[PDB]
Amino acid sequence: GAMNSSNYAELFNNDIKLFVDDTNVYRVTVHKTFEGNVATKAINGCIFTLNPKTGHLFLKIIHTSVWAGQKRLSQLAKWKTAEEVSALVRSLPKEEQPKQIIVTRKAMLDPLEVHMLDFPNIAIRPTELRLPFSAAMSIDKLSDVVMKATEPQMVLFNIYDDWLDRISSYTAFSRLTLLLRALKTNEESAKMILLSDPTITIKSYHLWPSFTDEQWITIESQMRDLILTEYGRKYNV
Amino acid sequence: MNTVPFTSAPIEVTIGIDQYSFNVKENQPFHGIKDIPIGHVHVIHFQHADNSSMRYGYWFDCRMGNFYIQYDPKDGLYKMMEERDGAKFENIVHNFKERQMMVSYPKIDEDDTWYNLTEFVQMDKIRKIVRKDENQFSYVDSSMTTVQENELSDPAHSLNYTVINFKSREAIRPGHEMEDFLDKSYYLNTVMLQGIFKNSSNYFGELQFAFLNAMFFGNYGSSLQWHAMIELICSSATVPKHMLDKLDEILYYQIKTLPEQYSDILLNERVWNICLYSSFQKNSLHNTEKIMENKYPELL
Ligand SMILES: COC(=O)CN(C)S(=O)(=O)c1ccccc1
Numbered sequence: 001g002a003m004n005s006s007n008y009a010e011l012f013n014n015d016i017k018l019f020v021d022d023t024n025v026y027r028v029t030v031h032k033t034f035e036g037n038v039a040t041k042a043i044n045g046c047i048f049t050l051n052p053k054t055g056h057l058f059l060k061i062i063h064t065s066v067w068a069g070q071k072r073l074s075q076l077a078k079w080k081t082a083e084e085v086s087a088l089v090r091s092l093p094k095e096e097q098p099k100q101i102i103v104t105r106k107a108m109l110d111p112l113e114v115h116m117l118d119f120p121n122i123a124i125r126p127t128e129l130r131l132p133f134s135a136a137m138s139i140d141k142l143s144d145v146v147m148k149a150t151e152p153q154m155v156l157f158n159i160y161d162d163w164l165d166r167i168s169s170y171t172a173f174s175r176l177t178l179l180l181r182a183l184k185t186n187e188e189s190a191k192m193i194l195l196s197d198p199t200i201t202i203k204s205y206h207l208w209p210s211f212t213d214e215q216w217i218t219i220e221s222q223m224r225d226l227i228l229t230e231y232g233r234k235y236n237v
Numbered sequence: 238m239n240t241v242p243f244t245s246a247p248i249e250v251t252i253g254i255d256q257y258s259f260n261v262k263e264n265q266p267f268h269g270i271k272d273i274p275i276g277h278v279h280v281i282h283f284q285h286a287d288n289s290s291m292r293y294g295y296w297f298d299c300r301m302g303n304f305y306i307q308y309d310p311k312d313g314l315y316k317m318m319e320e321r322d323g324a325k326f327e328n329i330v331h332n333f334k335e336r337q338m339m340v341s342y343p344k345i346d347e348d349d350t351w352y353n354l355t356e357f358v359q360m361d362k363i364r365k366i367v368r369k370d371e372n373q374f375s376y377v378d379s380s381m382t383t384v385q386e387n388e389l390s391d392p393a394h395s396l397n398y399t400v401i402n403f404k405s406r407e408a409i410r411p412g413h414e415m416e417d418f419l420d421k422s423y424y425l426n427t428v429m430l431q432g433i434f435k436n437s438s439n440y441f442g443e444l445q446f447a448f449l450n451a452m453f454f455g456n457y458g459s460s461l462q463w464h465a466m467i468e469l470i471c472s473s474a475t476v477p478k479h480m481l482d483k484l485d486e487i488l489y490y491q492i493k494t495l496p497e498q499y500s501d502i503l504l505n506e507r508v509w510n511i512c513l514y515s516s517f518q519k520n521s522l523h524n525t526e527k528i529m530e531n532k533y534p535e536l537l
Pocket residue numbers: 055056057058155156157158
């Protein structure tokens with residue numbers, strides 16, 4: 001059933017699974033009209049579909065043209081997400097298809113279940129974890145490819161870069177969630193932490209800087225501090 | 238007017254006949270029910286005084302044969318049987334009437350309740366839901382499960398209601414996933430009405446039969462079916478106008494007849510609130526919404 005703290009290690013076993021986050025599928029700017037009413041303007045979005053074991057991010061870019069002439073966009077966006085995840089699964093060889101799909105928001109359950117009726121053996125699951133995948137748009141290279149898209153497009157990224165050469169998927173996921181939680185809580189500070197040192201670069205084929213093991217511990221500490229810091233700034237503690 | 242004689246009443250029992258009921262004491266001189274209106278199905282039902290476990294009963298139509306009730310001390314229940322010897326039966330009934338050992342079906346002349354609850358219910362369709370083809374009447378009890386309940390375990394004793402499942406390939410056209418899930422008109426009108434039921438009369442008949450088994454036997458799977466069939470219509474944007482008007486009448490009389498103290502188990506809060514206030518047909522069930530709001534305003 002629901003994925004939570006009690007069964008967290010299940011994420012890193014050898015049953016193929018995907019997280020699906022739909023937060024950034026339908027994105028808008030709200031603005032005033034000449035007449036002084038309010039309107040929205042859509043901008044490009046993305047489905048965040050992630051294998052937590054391997055770091056495989058299938059980033060389906062959602063181009064604003066998909067909303068043209070459509071009504072009830074926040075509802076459509078869930079069904080569009082489900083249609084695109086179902087299309088992704090059907091595109092994979094059988095031995096690569098997931099056994100479970102975990103949605104980060106419960107409103108994706110029925111749309112995804114209905115789109116996956118053809119896959120009765122794929123379990124569609126919610127989670128009680130508050131995962132920070134909305135902050136994916138705070139990763140510069142992901143934001144860049146989404147905003148530049150002129151048409152629907154799927155882009156592939158290892159969200160762990162090469163970390164699995166040195167650490168387990170449990171530890172890589174924990175690092176990822178810490179980074180994304182930081183970026184979500186205070187993007188400016190988080191990005192300052194990550195880039196303040198010009199000698200540490202991001203490889204062309206990576207998302208995050210090339211920290212040594214020792215530097216990752218420093219970095220991870222700074223992200224915790226930031227999250228605890230902002231938690232006081234917010235609550236006055 | 239027809240008659241269902243009883244051989245005897247050896248155990249204390251509450252006997253129902255349609256929406257009526259009366260208490261019979263152990264070895265009281267009771268020999269059946271007379272003046273039963275011809276033209277409708279009927280249900281005769283039982284709850285033993287010593288064990289309210291298992292309400293049970295029989296759906297029958299007196300036009301289809303001469304039926305009587307006889308207690309079986311081995312199986313421990315009142316059984317319906319058919320008497321094939323017409324002269325024997327007529328002679329039995331006439332004697333029991335002459336000795337006035339029969340209760341009269343107590344229908345008030347003004348009162349259309351039973352007609353309104355059984356308008357579309359036919360014995361031939363009951364017998365396809367309740368399979369026991371060697372009898373002209375159909376046994377139902379509180380514990381019998383539905384075909385759908387058994388897919389989620391004795392097949393011979395099942396209620397074979399039409400399976401309705403809103404998250405199923407039958408309900409959902411490939412490529413119309415969002416459309417068909419949010420507007421069930423395809424599933425209602427093409428799959429169920431045109432495809433399975435053939436017409437709305439048969440649909441309403443099963444809906445009414447499911448309600449009556451829920452009310453009279455506390456049959457939980459029947460209650461599930463009744464609510465599913467309501468929800469499928471209410472969740473369809475495109476429903477023939479005559480079906481909506483008739484549905485409103487059907488549900489009105491069901492809600493009217495429901496015992497007040499059973500509303501908590503016989504009525505599904507989610508389905509009714511959705512149907513009356515959120516669904517496409519939220520404004521199409523005037524009679525049903527008015528009686529629900531005046532009789533069960535708590536549920537809503
Ligand atoms: C869908 O997969 C991915 O997002 C990740 N990979 C298959 S990969 O092996 O890391 C990779 C493969 C091709 C391109 C970039 C990365």
